[PDB]
């Protein structure tokens, strides 16, 4: 197989190049479950595999790295994904997380509220999102591009992702957005990554690798999602937890990637080539300041 010993499976380039029409997602392995190591939560396993895959890409890893994690709370009031990210990321990495619902976290700072209330002064080197609304999995109605938090994420990327930075945004059959796929063409490389532990689900992480701030490629996101579902529908993925047992090479290498401030005029093809190779981050190196907008109401009389 080979694939069962990987952390997961990335969408093969040839499927990206198709022009499929959107169909219903019918997974052969739906209902299968991987055998998780004793006492290990799905969320921990899933993030572990995501990070293992991200270790194979050309992520920029500067000193004083800035990472933000949306959708980080669980129904049990803790943040398993944040815990894996902080393990993975170099010690000292600035990690901020957020959720609609209250939770306790190991992040350096946590904001509770709708993601649309979240503002930051600074730019980020890596954006992770597990935001998901299970009310989108309505199989009886048409599956159109969704707005909501995806609209926030697309703006947040274009406004606050450092050039050279990367993203991983959770999608499913029904939880997806066409502009987010289009924005994948603004990175040097992109894919949809399915974890082997959760391969029975139409979930994937849409990964943009090394942001360029402009389209490198024009992607129709309606077509690309249909391509993604076509791939899933015709390529059963064997549930596997095998990669969870070898953590020896898990930590993200602190590459000390260079950070420069630059104005949109000085970004030439040589800068762009460095961005594209994971060798450069462009943003301010100022203090990290965040906030959550709070709506004020007085309900009396």
């Amino acid at each position: 197989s080979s694939q069962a010993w990987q952390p997961g499976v990335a969408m093969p380039n040839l499927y990206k190049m198709q022009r499929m029409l959107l169909e219903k997602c019918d997974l052969q392995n739906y209902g299968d479950s991987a055998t998780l190591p004793k006492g290990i939560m799905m969320n921990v396993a899933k993030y572990t595999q995501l990070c293992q895959y991200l270790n194979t890409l050309t992520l920029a890893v500067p000193y004083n790295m800035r990472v933000i994690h949306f959708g980080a709370g669980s129904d049990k009031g803790v943040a398993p994904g944040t815990a894996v990210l902080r393990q993975w990321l170099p010690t000292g990495t600035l990690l901020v997380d957020s959720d609609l619902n209250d939770f306790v976290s190991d992040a350096d700072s946590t904001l509770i509220g709708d993601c649309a209330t979240v503002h930051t002064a600074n730019k980020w080197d890596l954006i992770i999102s597990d935001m998901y609304d299970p009310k989108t999995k309505n199989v009886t109605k048409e599956n159109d591009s969704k707005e909501g938090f995806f609209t926030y994420i697309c703006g947040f990327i274009q406004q606050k992702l450092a050039l050279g930075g990367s993203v991983a945004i959770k999608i499913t059959e029904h939880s997806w957005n066409a502009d987010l796929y289009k924005l994948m063409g603004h990175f040097a490389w992109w894919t949809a990554f399915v974890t082997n532990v959760n391969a029975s689900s139409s979930e994937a992480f849409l990964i943009g690798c090394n942001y360029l701030g402009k389209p490198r490629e024009q992607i129709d996101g309606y077509v690309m999602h249909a391509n993604y579902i076509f791939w899933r529908n015709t390529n059963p993925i064997q549930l596997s937890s095998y990669s969870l047992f070898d953590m020896s090479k898990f930590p993200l290498k602190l590459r000390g990637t260079a950070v420069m401030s630059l104005k949109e005029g000085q970004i030439n093809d040589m800068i762009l080539s460095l961005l594209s190779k994971g060798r450069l981050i462009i943003r301010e190196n100022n203090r990290v300041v965040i906030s959550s907008d709070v709506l004020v109401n007085n309900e009396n009389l």
Binding site: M41, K76, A79, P80, A83, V104, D106, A107, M247, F250
Partner: protein, 116 residues
Amino acid sequence: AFAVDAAKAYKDYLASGGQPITNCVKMLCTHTGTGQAITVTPEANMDQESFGGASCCLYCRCHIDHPNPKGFCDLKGKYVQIPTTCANDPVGFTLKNTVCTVCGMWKGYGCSCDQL
């Protein structure tokens, strides 16, 4: 003059046969680490499990103030190593036990400072 004593309430709840706090976040790791008690990354050895710190802190989990006068947390943002034999109750373990200020191991579960 009045303060809630959540530490005591949990100790007494446990003694009365209550189910330990659950959903502590256990990490995947090599289990070839230093075995120190509270670390910046998982350091479980072969006899330990490593957990996300916040999820094993009574005060974090109960949404109450930390006994530190500054409210600071020893666990949040770090990883806590729990003997496998006590991993059914990490919160109880961290609350009842103490870290050697010299070697960083749990007194009684790794610390060999008082004669090896």
